[PDB]
Scaffold this active site. Structure first.
Site, PDB file in Angstrom:
ATOM      1  N   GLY A  16      54.146  52.453   2.583  1.00 21.38           N
ATOM      2  CA  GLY A  16      52.942  51.798   3.059  1.00 21.38           C
ATOM      3  C   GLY A  16      52.655  50.497   2.343  1.00 21.38           C
ATOM      4  O   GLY A  16      52.729  50.417   1.123  1.00 21.38           O
ATOM      5  N   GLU A  17      52.326  49.467   3.109  1.00 21.68           N
ATOM      6  CA  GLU A  17      52.022  48.172   2.536  1.00 21.68           C
ATOM      7  C   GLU A  17      50.881  47.521   3.296  1.00 21.68           C
ATOM      8  O   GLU A  17      50.635  47.841   4.450  1.00 21.68           O
ATOM      9  CB  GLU A  17      53.257  47.272   2.546  1.00 21.68           C
ATOM     10  CG  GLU A  17      53.414  46.440   3.799  1.00 21.68           C
ATOM     11  CD  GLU A  17      54.736  45.713   3.851  1.00 21.68           C
ATOM     12  OE1 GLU A  17      55.694  46.189   3.216  1.00 21.68           O
ATOM     13  OE2 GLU A  17      54.819  44.673   4.533  1.00 21.68           O
ATOM     14  N   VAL A  18      50.169  46.619   2.640  1.00 21.65           N
ATOM     15  CA  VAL A  18      49.079  45.924   3.288  1.00 21.65           C
ATOM     16  C   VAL A  18      49.348  44.433   3.226  1.00 21.65           C
ATOM     17  O   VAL A  18      49.544  43.887   2.154  1.00 21.65           O
ATOM     18  CB  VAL A  18      47.752  46.245   2.600  1.00 21.65           C
ATOM     19  CG1 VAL A  18      46.675  45.305   3.056  1.00 21.65           C
ATOM     20  CG2 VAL A  18      47.361  47.673   2.869  1.00 21.65           C
ATOM     21  N   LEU A  21      48.686  41.981   0.905  1.00 22.30           N
ATOM     22  CA  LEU A  21      47.578  42.192  -0.012  1.00 22.30           C
ATOM     23  C   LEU A  21      47.777  43.278  -1.062  1.00 22.30           C
ATOM     24  O   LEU A  21      47.497  43.068  -2.233  1.00 22.30           O
ATOM     25  CB  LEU A  21      46.322  42.528   0.789  1.00 22.30           C
ATOM     26  CG  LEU A  21      45.780  41.498   1.771  1.00 22.30           C
ATOM     27  CD1 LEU A  21      46.888  40.963   2.629  1.00 22.30           C
ATOM     28  CD2 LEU A  21      44.724  42.125   2.636  1.00 22.30           C
ATOM     29  N   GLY A  22      48.265  44.440  -0.654  1.00 24.23           N
ATOM     30  CA  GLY A  22      48.437  45.512  -1.609  1.00 24.23           C
ATOM     31  C   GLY A  22      49.656  46.396  -1.490  1.00 24.23           C
ATOM     32  O   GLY A  22      49.529  47.608  -1.352  1.00 24.23           O
ATOM     33  N   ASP A  66      38.073  59.567  -3.316  1.00 26.24           N
ATOM     34  CA  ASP A  66      38.812  58.790  -4.287  1.00 26.24           C
ATOM     35  C   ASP A  66      38.109  57.487  -4.598  1.00 26.24           C
ATOM     36  O   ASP A  66      38.667  56.428  -4.384  1.00 26.24           O
ATOM     37  CB  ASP A  66      40.214  58.507  -3.758  1.00 26.24           C
ATOM     38  CG  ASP A  66      41.152  58.026  -4.827  1.00 26.24           C
ATOM     39  OD1 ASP A  66      42.232  57.518  -4.495  1.00 26.24           O
ATOM     40  OD2 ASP A  66      40.806  58.160  -6.003  1.00 26.24           O
ATOM     41  N   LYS A  85      47.646  47.444   7.787  1.00 27.62           N
ATOM     42  CA  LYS A  85      48.335  48.450   7.024  1.00 27.62           C
ATOM     43  C   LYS A  85      49.626  48.750   7.735  1.00 27.62           C
ATOM     44  O   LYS A  85      49.641  48.948   8.942  1.00 27.62           O
ATOM     45  CB  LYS A  85      47.484  49.710   6.912  1.00 27.62           C
ATOM     46  CG  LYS A  85      47.778  50.547   5.691  1.00 27.62           C
ATOM     47  CD  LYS A  85      46.702  51.570   5.459  1.00 27.62           C
ATOM     48  CE  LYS A  85      46.948  52.329   4.177  1.00 27.62           C
ATOM     49  NZ  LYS A  85      45.873  53.321   3.927  1.00 27.62           N
TER      50      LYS A  85
HETATM   51  C1  LIG Z   1      43.415  40.297  -3.703  1.00 28.07           C
HETATM   52  C2  LIG Z   1      42.823  40.072  -2.471  1.00 28.07           C
HETATM   53  C3  LIG Z   1      42.690  41.108  -1.564  1.00 28.07           C
HETATM   54  C4  LIG Z   1      43.141  42.371  -1.904  1.00 28.07           C
HETATM   55  C5  LIG Z   1      43.188  43.571  -1.229  1.00 28.07           C
HETATM   56  C6  LIG Z   1      42.646  43.725   0.039  1.00 28.07           C
HETATM   57  C7  LIG Z   1      41.899  42.857   0.701  1.00 28.07           C
HETATM   58  N1  LIG Z   1      41.540  43.386   1.867  1.00 28.07           N
HETATM   59  C8  LIG Z   1      42.032  44.614   1.964  1.00 28.07           C
HETATM   60  C9  LIG Z   1      41.948  45.579   2.953  1.00 28.07           C
HETATM   61  N2  LIG Z   1      42.539  46.746   2.802  1.00 28.07           N
HETATM   62  C10 LIG Z   1      43.247  47.043   1.705  1.00 28.07           C
HETATM   63  C11 LIG Z   1      43.834  48.299   1.611  1.00 28.07           C
HETATM   64  C12 LIG Z   1      43.725  49.279   2.489  1.00 28.07           C
HETATM   65  N3  LIG Z   1      44.418  50.313   2.028  1.00 28.07           N
HETATM   66  N4  LIG Z   1      44.921  50.021   0.944  1.00 28.07           N
HETATM   67  C13 LIG Z   1      44.584  48.774   0.629  1.00 28.07           C
HETATM   68  C14 LIG Z   1      43.362  46.119   0.670  1.00 28.07           C
HETATM   69  N5  LIG Z   1      42.733  44.882   0.807  1.00 28.07           N
HETATM   70  C15 LIG Z   1      43.736  44.473  -2.031  1.00 28.07           C
HETATM   71  N6  LIG Z   1      44.081  43.883  -3.176  1.00 28.07           N
HETATM   72  C16 LIG Z   1      43.741  42.599  -3.127  1.00 28.07           C
HETATM   73  C17 LIG Z   1      43.876  41.561  -4.035  1.00 28.07           C
END
Ligand SMILES: c1ccc2c(-c3cnc4cnc(-c5cn[nH]c5)cn34)c[nH]c2c1
Length: 252
Positions: free
Chosen positions: A12-14, A10-11, A113, A29
């Site tokens: 250290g990496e997510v 979705l987005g 933030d 995460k």
């Molecule tokens: C399209 C769809 C979902 C996400 C996210 C997303 C969706 N759900 C989460 C949960 N946590 C995070 C996150 C936690 N820490 N940094 C990012 C990002 N997310 C970040 N960017 C996106 C772009």
């Protein structure tokens, strides 16, 4: 305690995760002290407008955070540059933003933030506050503690943080929220930073609201903003007061 696929990052990496048995989706995460505090704070938090933390597994040196998945993406992408978004949409995100923020403060936690990037939208388009990596505790046992460390994003950050050794945690959060409100309604950010050196900030202080992004913003929304982006964090409107604001309670 069952396998998760790890479908996409979705987005250290997510990376988004989906359960094989149940098909539930989670945001995980991947982190290769700050991490320990983040988990500690997440355990505390339960609210509709705050991202849900499920669990953590310590594997190898890698730390796993199980977090709610927001299909919505980030609020950042719901703003069209130089235009922002419809006033009704903004008010609703703001009502939700205030709800999430109020909860954290009673809970004694400041995000530190707040920005669109950190505000996530679920399937129903409901706003969620995401990422407690910079968050800290400002009230413990009913005693407040002043913050002296600087963190955040410069455009979003409060003026006091730049010019003062110690500042209150809550007012810094309100200012960031106001700036987010400005972006939603204008599609642009007012100043690179809240400094006298910055020309744009000075104009706002001079009240030259005949200029962008203020020109774009309606008078009712703007009146609230005048109250929020007040340089003296002590004279700055409080969240309880924001609720009483006329625009805030205007049926749109
Ligand atoms: C399209 C769809 C979902 C996400 C996210 C997303 C969706 N759900 C989460 C949960 N946590 C995070 C996150 C936690 N820490 N940094 C990012 C990002 N997310 C970040 N960017 C996106 C772009």
């Amino acid at each position: 305690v069952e396998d998760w696929d790890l479908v996409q990052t979705l987005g250290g990496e997510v990376q988004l995760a989906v359960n094989r048995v149940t098909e539930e989706a989670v945001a995980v995460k991947i982190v290769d002290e700050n991490i320990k505090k983040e988990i500690c704070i997440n355990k505390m938090l339960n609210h509709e407008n705050v991202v849900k933390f499920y669990g953590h597994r310590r594997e190898g040196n890698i730390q796993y955070l199980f977090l709610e998945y927001c299909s919505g993406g980030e609020l950042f992408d719901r703003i069209e540059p130089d235009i922002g978004m419809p006033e009704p949409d903004a008010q609703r995100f703001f009502h939700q933003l205030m709800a999430g923020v109020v909860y954290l403060h009673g809970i004694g936690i400041t995000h530190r933030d707040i920005k669109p990037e950190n505000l996530l939208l679920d399937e129903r388009d409901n706003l969620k506050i995401s990422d407690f990596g910079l968050a800290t505790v400002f009230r413990y046992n009913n005693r407040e503690r002043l913050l002296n460390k600087m963190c955040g994003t410069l455009p979003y950050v409060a003026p006091e943080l730049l010019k003062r050794r110690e500042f209150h945690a809550e007012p810094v959060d309100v200012w960031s929220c106001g700036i987010v409100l400005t972006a939603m309604l204008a599609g642009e950010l007012p100043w690179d930073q809240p400094s006298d050196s910055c020309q744009e900030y000075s104009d706002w202080k001079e009240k030259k609201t005949y200029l962008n992004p203020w020109k774009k913003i309606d008078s009712a929304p703007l009146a609230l903003l005048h109250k929020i982006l007040v340089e003296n964090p002590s004279a700055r409107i409080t969240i309880p007061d924001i609720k009483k604001d006329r625009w805030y309670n205007k049926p749109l």
